[PDB]
Each structure stands twice: as C-alpha cells, then as structure tokens.
Design a protein around this motif. Sequence first.
Motif, PDB file in Angstrom:
ATOM      1  N   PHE B 291       0.617  -1.379  -0.116  1.00  0.00           N
ATOM      2  CA  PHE B 291       0.298  -0.570  -0.483  1.00  0.00           C
ATOM      3  C   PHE B 291       1.276   1.459  -0.426  1.00  0.00           C
ATOM      4  O   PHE B 291       1.885   1.553   1.192  1.00  0.00           O
ATOM      5  CB  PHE B 291      -0.371  -0.288   1.123  1.00  0.00           C
ATOM      6  CG  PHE B 291      -2.158  -1.133   1.652  1.00  0.00           C
ATOM      7  CD1 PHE B 291      -3.161  -0.654   0.526  1.00  0.00           C
ATOM      8  CD2 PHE B 291      -1.809  -1.865   1.751  1.00  0.00           C
ATOM      9  CE1 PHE B 291      -4.352  -1.414   0.507  1.00  0.00           C
ATOM     10  CE2 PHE B 291      -3.030  -3.415   1.959  1.00  0.00           C
ATOM     11  CZ  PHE B 291      -4.265  -3.333   0.892  1.00  0.00           C
ATOM     12  N   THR B 292       0.700   2.725  -0.651  1.00  0.00           N
ATOM     13  CA  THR B 292       1.545   2.850  -1.233  1.00  0.00           C
ATOM     14  C   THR B 292       1.290   4.590  -0.294  1.00  0.00           C
ATOM     15  O   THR B 292      -0.207   4.590   0.317  1.00  0.00           O
ATOM     16  CB  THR B 292       1.844   3.556  -2.643  1.00  0.00           C
ATOM     17  OG1 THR B 292       0.124   4.414  -2.991  1.00  0.00           O
ATOM     18  CG2 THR B 292       2.252   3.001  -3.876  1.00  0.00           C
ATOM     19  N   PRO B 293       1.224   5.749   0.070  1.00  0.00           N
ATOM     20  CA  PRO B 293       0.365   7.119   0.918  1.00  0.00           C
ATOM     21  C   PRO B 293      -0.121   7.055   0.094  1.00  0.00           C
ATOM     22  O   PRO B 293      -1.482   7.281   0.427  1.00  0.00           O
ATOM     23  CB  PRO B 293       1.869   7.754   0.819  1.00  0.00           C
ATOM     24  CG  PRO B 293       2.835   6.731   1.014  1.00  0.00           C
ATOM     25  CD  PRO B 293       2.323   5.896  -0.030  1.00  0.00           C
ATOM     26  N   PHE B 294      -0.130   7.054  -1.525  1.00  0.00           N
ATOM     27  CA  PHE B 294      -2.121   7.754  -2.260  1.00  0.00           C
ATOM     28  C   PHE B 294      -2.580   6.941  -2.148  1.00  0.00           C
ATOM     29  O   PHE B 294      -4.052   6.904  -2.397  1.00  0.00           O
ATOM     30  CB  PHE B 294      -1.525   7.790  -3.565  1.00  0.00           C
ATOM     31  CG  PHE B 294      -2.313   7.668  -4.910  1.00  0.00           C
ATOM     32  CD1 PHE B 294      -2.641   8.729  -5.215  1.00  0.00           C
ATOM     33  CD2 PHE B 294      -2.874   6.686  -5.843  1.00  0.00           C
ATOM     34  CE1 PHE B 294      -3.955   8.516  -6.599  1.00  0.00           C
ATOM     35  CE2 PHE B 294      -4.034   6.481  -6.003  1.00  0.00           C
ATOM     36  CZ  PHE B 294      -4.244   7.718  -6.433  1.00  0.00           C
ATOM     37  N   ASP B 295      -1.900   5.264  -1.948  1.00  0.00           N
ATOM     38  CA  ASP B 295      -3.291   4.022  -1.765  1.00  0.00           C
ATOM     39  C   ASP B 295      -3.580   4.100  -0.666  1.00  0.00           C
ATOM     40  O   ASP B 295      -5.177   4.606  -0.010  1.00  0.00           O
ATOM     41  CB  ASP B 295      -2.646   2.401  -1.771  1.00  0.00           C
ATOM     42  CG  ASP B 295      -2.103   2.106  -3.356  1.00  0.00           C
ATOM     43  OD1 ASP B 295      -2.595   3.299  -4.246  1.00  0.00           O
ATOM     44  OD2 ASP B 295      -1.406   1.100  -3.084  1.00  0.00           O
ATOM     45  N   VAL B 296      -3.172   4.492  -0.217  1.00  0.00           N
ATOM     46  CA  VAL B 296      -4.364   5.139   1.866  1.00  0.00           C
ATOM     47  C   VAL B 296      -5.215   5.895   2.032  1.00  0.00           C
ATOM     48  O   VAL B 296      -5.986   6.230   1.946  1.00  0.00           O
ATOM     49  CB  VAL B 296      -2.771   5.306   2.592  1.00  0.00           C
ATOM     50  CG1 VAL B 296      -3.752   4.989   4.338  1.00  0.00           C
ATOM     51  CG2 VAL B 296      -2.094   4.320   3.028  1.00  0.00           C
ATOM     52  N   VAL B 297      -4.512   7.499   1.124  1.00  0.00           N
ATOM     53  CA  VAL B 297      -5.190   8.491   0.591  1.00  0.00           C
ATOM     54  C   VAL B 297      -6.698   8.102   0.317  1.00  0.00           C
ATOM     55  O   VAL B 297      -7.412   9.037   0.814  1.00  0.00           O
ATOM     56  CB  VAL B 297      -4.406   9.562   0.731  1.00  0.00           C
ATOM     57  CG1 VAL B 297      -5.157  11.298   0.088  1.00  0.00           C
ATOM     58  CG2 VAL B 297      -3.211   9.972   1.496  1.00  0.00           C
ATOM     59  N   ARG B 298      -6.209   7.895  -0.771  1.00  0.00           N
ATOM     60  CA  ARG B 298      -7.397   6.964  -1.942  1.00  0.00           C
ATOM     61  C   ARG B 298      -8.427   6.899  -0.955  1.00  0.00           C
ATOM     62  O   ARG B 298      -9.748   6.724  -1.513  1.00  0.00           O
ATOM     63  CB  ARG B 298      -6.645   6.335  -2.751  1.00  0.00           C
ATOM     64  CG  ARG B 298      -8.132   5.721  -3.505  1.00  0.00           C
ATOM     65  CD  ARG B 298      -7.028   4.897  -4.803  1.00  0.00           C
ATOM     66  NE  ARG B 298      -8.048   4.164  -5.505  1.00  0.00           N
ATOM     67  CZ  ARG B 298      -7.515   2.539  -5.438  1.00  0.00           C
ATOM     68  NH1 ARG B 298      -6.753   2.262  -5.015  1.00  0.00           N
ATOM     69  NH2 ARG B 298      -8.871   1.823  -6.621  1.00  0.00           N
ATOM     70  N   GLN B 299      -9.001   5.922   0.081  1.00  0.00           N
ATOM     71  CA  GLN B 299      -9.331   4.456   0.962  1.00  0.00           C
ATOM     72  C   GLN B 299      -9.824   5.218   2.032  1.00  0.00           C
ATOM     73  O   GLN B 299     -11.070   4.909   2.938  1.00  0.00           O
ATOM     74  CB  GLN B 299      -8.257   3.763   0.738  1.00  0.00           C
ATOM     75  CG  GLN B 299      -9.500   2.075   0.621  1.00  0.00           C
ATOM     76  CD  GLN B 299      -8.825   0.885   0.911  1.00  0.00           C
ATOM     77  OE1 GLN B 299      -9.616  -0.306   1.395  1.00  0.00           O
ATOM     78  NE2 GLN B 299      -7.631   0.374   0.544  1.00  0.00           N
ATOM     79  N   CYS B 300      -8.556   6.162   2.667  1.00  0.00           N
ATOM     80  CA  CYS B 300      -9.290   6.666   4.408  1.00  0.00           C
ATOM     81  C   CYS B 300      -9.524   8.378   4.698  1.00  0.00           C
ATOM     82  O   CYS B 300      -9.863   8.244   5.922  1.00  0.00           O
ATOM     83  CB  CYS B 300      -7.775   6.739   5.086  1.00  0.00           C
ATOM     84  SG  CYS B 300      -7.405   4.711   5.096  1.00  0.00           S
ATOM     85  N   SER B 301      -9.597   8.558   3.335  1.00  0.00           N
ATOM     86  CA  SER B 301     -10.293  10.801   3.003  1.00  0.00           C
ATOM     87  C   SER B 301     -11.358  10.466   3.275  1.00  0.00           C
ATOM     88  O   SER B 301     -11.811  11.019   3.946  1.00  0.00           O
ATOM     89  CB  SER B 301      -9.210  10.762   1.551  1.00  0.00           C
ATOM     90  OG  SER B 301      -8.098  10.822   1.823  1.00  0.00           O
TER      91      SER B 301
END
Lengths: 301, 301
Positions: B291-301
């Motif tokens: 999981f990339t920083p982008f992947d996390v923001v995508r799913q958790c924002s």
Amino acid sequence: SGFRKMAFPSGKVEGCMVQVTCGTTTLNGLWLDDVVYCPRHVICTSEDMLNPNYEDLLIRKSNHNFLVQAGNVQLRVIGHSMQNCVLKLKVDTANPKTPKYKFVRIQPGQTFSVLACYNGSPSGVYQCAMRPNFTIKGSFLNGSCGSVGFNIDYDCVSFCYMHHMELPTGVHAGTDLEGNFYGPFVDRQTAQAAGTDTTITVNVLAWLYAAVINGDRWFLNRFTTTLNDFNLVAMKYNYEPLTQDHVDILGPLSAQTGIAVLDMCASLKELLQNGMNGRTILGSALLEDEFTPFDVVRQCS
Amino acid sequence: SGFRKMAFPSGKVEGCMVQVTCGTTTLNGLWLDDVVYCPRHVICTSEDMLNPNYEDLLIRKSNHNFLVQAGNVQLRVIGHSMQNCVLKLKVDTANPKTPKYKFVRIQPGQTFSVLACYNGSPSGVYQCAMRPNFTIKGSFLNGSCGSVGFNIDYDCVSFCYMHHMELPTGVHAGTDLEGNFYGPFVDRQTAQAAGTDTTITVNVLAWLYAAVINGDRWFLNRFTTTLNDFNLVAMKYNYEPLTQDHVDILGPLSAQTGIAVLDMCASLKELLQNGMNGRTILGSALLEDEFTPFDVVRQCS
Ligand SMILES: C[C@H]1C(=O)[C@]23[C@H](O)[C@H]1CC[C@H]2[C@@]12CO[C@]3(O)[C@@H](O)[C@@H]1C(C)(C)CC[C@@H]2O
Ligand SMILES: C[C@H]1C(=O)[C@]23[C@H](O)[C@H]1CC[C@H]2[C@@]12CO[C@]3(O)[C@@H](O)[C@@H]1C(C)(C)CC[C@@H]2O
C-alpha cells in the motif's frame, strides 16, 4: 502459480451504476432495464435516520423529488415503490448496458466482489465473504451506500448484496437485491451490534490445499484424525463445525494434491494448538477463511 | 471505515482484451485504436523458447500467420512489427471502446491493478506492487501471458505492465508497454532467478497510518527516533532506507492523524525488534508493504 484475493472483472456492473438524490441526501443506485434499485433511507434526512416510518415518508414523496444521473444524462423517474428496505424507481429509459443478471441470496461463508462507488462513480473492486454473523468486513466511506456485491458465472451477473449501513465495530450490514437484510439489522442508525463471529473452517481447509498446490508443504504431517475428534478442537478455537458435505466439497482438491481431507484436518489441529512459529502460508502469518473451495479451484486449476 | 487491497474498476481494460494465435501458440493481446500489443514470444514454439532469435523468427512470418479474435469477431491483421520484446499487429478496425490512455513505466514500490485474462477472456482483477527486485507476486496460470497491469487517473488508463514469464521461485516478470523488461530478465525459459528482495519501508509506514485512521492504536508509543538511527535498524531487517522525500510524502497522513513521521518510525523499530505478540494490524499478523501513501489517502480520506 501464485495466490491472490481476486475480484470478478467489474465492467458489466460499472455500466449499471447511477447517482440517486432526494433533497440533500445522495447515494448509489443500480440501473437494470427501466428500474433503478437503491436503499430506501435515501428518502430520510440526518434527523429521520434516528427512528423513521418509511411508509409515511414515501407517501409524502412524488417522482419529481428523485434526481437520477447516469454519469451526465439525467433519467426521468416515471414511478416509485418500496420493496422491503429497497426503493424501485421506474425510469424513462431501459439501460442499454443491462447484462444477463439474477438476484440470488448467498449463505454465510460464501464470497463475492464489491464495486465500491461514490455519487454513482465506481472507485474500486475487492473480494468479500459473508461472515457467519451476517456482517461483511468491507471498505466504505460516506456516500458508498447503494454499492453492490456480485458474482459472475459465464456472462451472468448474480447480484447478492447492496450496502446500507456501518456498525459500531466498523463492520458493514446490507440487504439482498429484494431488500431483505442479511442478519438481525435494520435501516436506522441505532444501538445495533454484530453478534459473536466464528472462523469458516471449510474455507481455511480449501486455502491449505491452495498452499500445497503452490508448494507450501511445511504444515503437513503423517497424522490423521476423525471428523468428531477434529470438531472437538474446532469448538475450542471458535471454528465452525465441519460436516460430511464440507469433506465431499473438498474432494476434488483432496484428489488433485493426494492429501485426504481428514489428513489436512490433522494439520489444522496442529496449527491451532502450536501456531506457525515465525513461518507463513501463501504470504500470510494467520489462517485465511475468505477463500471458498470454488475460489481455490478457479485460481489453481 | 475498513481497509482492503482494492483494484481499479477493470471495465475500460476489459474492452481492449483480445486473443492472439500464431501456429499452436495462443495468449492475450491489448487492442488500442488500430494496433494490438502482445508478447513477441507468441511467434515461438515449445522448442524455440529455449534460445530464440526473434528477428529470424519474425522475418519468416506474414500477416495471415496471426489470428486475432475480439470475442467472436476476427480482426484482419494488415501489418506487423517488433518493438523491443512486444509485437505490434496493425489491424483492419480501430477499437471503438479505446479509452483515454498513456504508456507509463512505474518505479519499484508503486502499485497497479492486474486484469488476469485467458484466451482474451478476463477472469479476475487484483492489486500488485512492483517489488524492489523488479518482480511481481501475481496469480498467473498457462495462457495468462499478455495480461496487463494499469492505474486509472480520472478517465485515463496508465498501462504500466504486460506479463511475459514465471520465474523459478513462482514470481512473475514482464515489460512496460514499450516492450522494455522490468529488471534483468529476458523472454526465454532459462536459468534466470530473482535477485534478493527488500521490504518497501515507506509503504509499511503509510499502512500504519491507515491502521491509526481505522482505530488500531496499540503499536503507538511516546518515543521518537532520528532518520539515521531508524535507517540503522532498517538495514538489519532488510528494509529499504527511508529518505527526506519519503517523510515529506507521508506529511498529509502525519497531519491527519497528528502523529509525526519519526514518531511512527519509532513504532516500526519496536514492531521489528519485538514482533506483534499474537496481536494484528488491519486483519494482518505481519507488516504489509504493498500500500502506497496515495493508496491509503484514496481509501481513508
Ligand atoms: C449510508 C450508510 C453510511 O455510510 C452511514 C450509515 O452507516 C449508513 C446510513 C447513513 C450513513 C450516515 C450515518 O453513518 C454512516 O456511516 C455515515 O457514512 C453517514 C454520514 C456521512 C455521517 C452522513 C449521515 C448518514 O446518516
Ligand atoms: C507465457 C509465460 C508462461 O506462463 C510460461 C512462461 O512463464 C512464459 C513464457 C512461456 C510459458 C510456458 C513455459 O512456462 C510457463 O510458465 C508456462 O505457463 C507455459 C506452458 C504452459 C508450460 C506452455 C509452454 C510455455 O513455453
């Protein structure tokens, strides 16, 4: 070779996803032929969600109160009715991308693909299992309601889930496409809580067969056990009892690897009693229970 | 709430997948405008794959030797050329389902969705990372070659991977869409082996932020550390060094949770030295690095 949590290709479902707006409340709808299916709580405000009376709330609505957008194109709603906890909005136009489909209710322990959507816009696809306690461990943010779960057999989409609510433990509750809830949950934001969950024993056994087929063998042993003596162990570690149908369903996988079902049960007993000892199975350090016998055959045949 | 390994919706890619047959060898092709892209080893027999000379093998072929089927419809090939390790087959018809697309080469540590296909028929979708050693841990059976990896930004499909071969350890090697291999691999079934892999440190940190946002807090501590003292620990446990750009990229996640990057590094140090103690993070008993920083923001924002 290799083993991944694999979803069905989502294209056939992407073409059915629309946005449904009533007042200031917006969520996702499923557009099949000239009907759009969505959660009935779209007619509720922030205040109403406490304790709504949906018959009273719906009778005070008309067709023009429902805004349906298929991407850019707005769909004219010409009829509305309530079927259990889903709203059926009859529209001007038959969806030209309507695939061959069925509405099927699935059993606890079975898997399906979820197309997470926001404002009728597909965001991502992932694989879920229906937990023994009729919850799912999904990934859903505000505006994900109306997102559907499904399987694909040949060219036919079997719709099995529509997302309605999030529970206190951060797990998810929804209905089949006839609007009947999975488990003892209702569409009001109240004090409901998931009952105690168990591990899906048959799925863990199927996953151990997947590991063997992909060259993970370290957990195998010469021992076997009886279905009774295994089920005594299952009960202690909060695993579901194994039945003769479960061992029958594992028959093909048993034959492919040449390891008898009750031999593999002996391996599971040891893993439960001893643990893994810093070792992994198919890139996991715990026993995975969201792969069915079918899911394994699909990916390993 | 919730956190899942989430693939991009696959619809836009499903409509580009075709079957390419040359002699008795068949695999998957990507049909964009009036060109079909596929692995060049489609021109090789079982015998040739030992040590082929692709220039000699291609010069002895003509357009009529290539069978391309877009589901039922057969596409007439009117031109052929080799670009590195991919074949470009110019066809009669421009794909009417051609999406907005780019050919991008990704970096080790970055993620993408794979649409596993068999005989031009999509079977399933799953999320992968490009490993530091330029392999991927996919799920591929015979006939999966030509299957593509991709990301979706807005309406644009960024194609980054085409699958070519399986390596001895059961891991996978392929090219970008210009036919240039990821890592030191070649399209012949020979004695090639993956170099030593490392854990993607920045991804593990991003995943710990995802855990915090979803209410897993047990691994947090009052301690902090320096970037130098952390990197000494990383080296010992075969983790990639962390850089100032890595902590900068984790800035937004740091701000959202109110836990400084170097504070979270202190938590990772402890988890590496002590382990988890029968405890889990986001339903995992090991530290997840796909999981990339982008992947996390995508799913958790
Ligand atoms: C659609 C589902 C959903 O996501 C709900 C529930 O889990 C369920 C029904 C209602 C929303 C939500 C109440 O709780 C929610 O979890 C939340 O996402 C919603 C907002 C963002 C707080 C807005 C008000 C809204 O009442
Ligand atoms: C397309 C990829 C692929 O899947 C290959 C390699 O990993 C790669 C290239 C060749 C095939 C394969 C040799 O090894 C393979 O792993 C295997 O699946 C193939 C068969 C089924 C044995 C048929 C012969 C064939 O040469």
